[PDB]
Amino acid sequence: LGIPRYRPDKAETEPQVGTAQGLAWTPVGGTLLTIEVAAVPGSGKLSLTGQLGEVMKESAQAALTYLRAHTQDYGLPEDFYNKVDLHVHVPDGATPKDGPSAGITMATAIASALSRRPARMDIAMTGEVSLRGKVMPIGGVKEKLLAAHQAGIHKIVLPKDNEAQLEELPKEVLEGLEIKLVEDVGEVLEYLLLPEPTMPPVV
Amino acid sequence: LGIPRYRPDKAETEPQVGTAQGLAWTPVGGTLLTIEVAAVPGSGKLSLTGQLGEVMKESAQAALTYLRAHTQDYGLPEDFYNKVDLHVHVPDGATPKDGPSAGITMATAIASALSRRPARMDIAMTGEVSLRGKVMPIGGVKEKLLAAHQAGIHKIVLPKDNEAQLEELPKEVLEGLEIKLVEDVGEVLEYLLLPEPTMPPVV
Ligand SMILES: *[B]([O])([O])[C]([C]C1=[C][C]=[C][C]=[C]1)[N]C(=O)[C]([C]C1=[C][C]=[C][C]=[C]1)[N]C(=O)C1=[C]N=[C][C]=N1
Numbered sequence: 001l002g003i004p005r006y007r008p009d010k011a012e013t014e015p016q017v018g019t020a021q022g023l024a025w026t027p028v029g030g031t032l033l034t035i036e037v038a039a040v041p042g043s044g045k046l047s048l049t050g051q052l053g054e055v056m057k058e059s060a061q062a063a064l065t066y067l068r069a070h071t072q073d074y075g076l077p078e079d080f081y082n083k084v085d086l087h088v089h090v091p092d093g094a095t096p097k098d099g100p101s102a103g104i105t106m107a108t109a110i111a112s113a114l115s116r117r118p119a120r121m122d123i124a125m126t127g128e129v130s131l132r133g134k135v136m137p138i139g140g141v142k143e144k145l146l147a148a149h150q151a152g153i154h155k156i157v158l159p160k161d162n163e164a165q166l167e168e169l170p171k172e173v174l175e176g177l178e179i180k181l182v183e184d185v186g187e188v189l190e191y192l193l194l195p196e197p198t199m200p201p202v203v
Numbered sequence: 204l205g206i207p208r209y210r211p212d213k214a215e216t217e218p219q220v221g222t223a224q225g226l227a228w229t230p231v232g233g234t235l236l237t238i239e240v241a242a243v244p245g246s247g248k249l250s251l252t253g254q255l256g257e258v259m260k261e262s263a264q265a266a267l268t269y270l271r272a273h274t275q276d277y278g279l280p281e282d283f284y285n286k287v288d289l290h291v292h293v294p295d296g297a298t299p300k301d302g303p304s305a306g307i308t309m310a311t312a313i314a315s316a317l318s319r320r321p322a323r324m325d326i327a328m329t330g331e332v333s334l335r336g337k338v339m340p341i342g343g344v345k346e347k348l349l350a351a352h353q354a355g356i357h358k359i360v361l362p363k364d365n366e367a368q369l370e371e372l373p374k375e376v377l378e379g380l381e382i383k384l385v386e387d388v389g390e391v392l393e394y395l396l397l398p399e400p401t402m403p404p405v406v
């Protein structure tokens with residue numbers, strides 16, 4: 001056949017600070033999308049790069065407002081709204097992405113970047129977040145969970161209103177996975193972030 | 204035949220502050236391109252001229268956010284987000300350019316311009332950058348390495364994941380070149396930037 005012309009996507013292992021593992025629906029199956037966030041000193045801004053649509057940008061702003069409202073439940077700095085520039089980048093560039101099922105993935109990445117606590121990278125997430133912190137049901141559960149099982153991820157966070165859709169999965173992938181059902185984003189942040197900080201916090 | 208129609212590409216020799224050599228792909232063939240960055244006193248702005256597309260404009264901001272995050276690894280001034288203005292120019296002005304494959308070139312040019320250390324100009328380079336330093340593979344490798352050989356450049360910097368496309372090259376070209384394979388951009392910045400700045404610092 002010749003030179004191998006595709007690279008199979010594969011799970012990461014160690015916990016990263018500022019990074020979270022999301023799941024995406026494409027018309028040729030599901031894929032793993034990785035969301036990464038940096039928090040540098042600045043004046044309070046929000047760059048959103050990676051060819052993102054408008055629904056995804058609005059979901060990132062909703063996640064940031066939820067974290068601005070609860071700045072001492074998670075150990076965030078006291079005034080990051082005024083001293084810290086945030087940059088959300090979803091690689092790769094030159095591939096357009098859209099949709100809101102990425103709300104809790106961006107919430108996890110942003111809260112990991114602001115308070116220097118790593119995020120576990122062997123748990124794939126999906127779900128839509130609101131401004132009170134409610135996790136709302138999403139679409140395309142079957143393809144996303146299939147492609148997460150193909151790539152060696154064995155733990156999922158998923159909205160609680162999607163357990164009706166866990167009957168159309170194949171039995172082989174449903175025995176492989178450990179589904180956690182949530183209905184509130186504080187459970188997600190308590191389960192994903194490692195308890196102890198590593199980096200120096202950005203002033 | 205008369206007056207020559209097409210001026211050929213030429214490689215520079217001397218190290219220069221603020222420039223870096225990049226490769227590009229056209230459907231006719233490869234091309235050399237040069238990135239230029241100026242860092243003058245100002246208030247923190249980012250002009251991007253030369254008919255750049257959106258993906259290339261986002262590559263520039265991802266590279267700059269990376270460098271704002273690691274500001275004492277490379278001897279950058281500790282507050283350049285407030286005090287300098289950057290301007291990235293890609294000659295020539297009339298031809299539209301697009302795509303994210305030139306992130307490693309822009310990161311080298313920006314770090315050279317900010318840290319006052321000249322970058323080596325006998326090394327062509329290419330590669331997509333992400334927000335935490337990981338290089339991402341690119342496409343169209345043989346046209347670019349072919350065009351860099353017949354312009355007189357015998358050192359390439361290439362992503363690690365593009366090692367598999369090096370068997371498309373002819374044998375004499377591959378014996379001519381000296382490929383260096385990278386994963387992080389710290390490796391690229393150590394290989395390209397000379398020590399010991401040769402300009403007074405912008406402050
Ligand atoms: B979610 O709404 O089901 C999800 C949003 C998402 C995924 C990953 C990263 C950021 C956001 N949507 C998708 O999977 C979308 C397609 C879509 C969007 C809205 C409604 C229905 C379907 N995925 C993409 O657009 C995509 C696909 N492949 C690569 C990159 N992006």
Ligand SMILES: *[B]([O])([O])[C]([C]C1=[C][C]=[C][C]=[C]1)[N]C(=O)[C]([C]C1=[C][C]=[C][C]=[C]1)[N]C(=O)C1=[C]N=[C][C]=N1
Pocket residue numbers: 225226227228229234236237259293298299300301302303304305
């Ligand atoms: B990269 O995306 O492959 C590369 C980035 C680049 C290189 C050199 C100078 C500026 C930018 N771009 C290209 O190779 C593109 C073609 C392309 C675009 C999108 C995806 C893949 C490839 N070509 C140009 O920008 C170009 C080439 N020659 C003259 C003018 N522009």
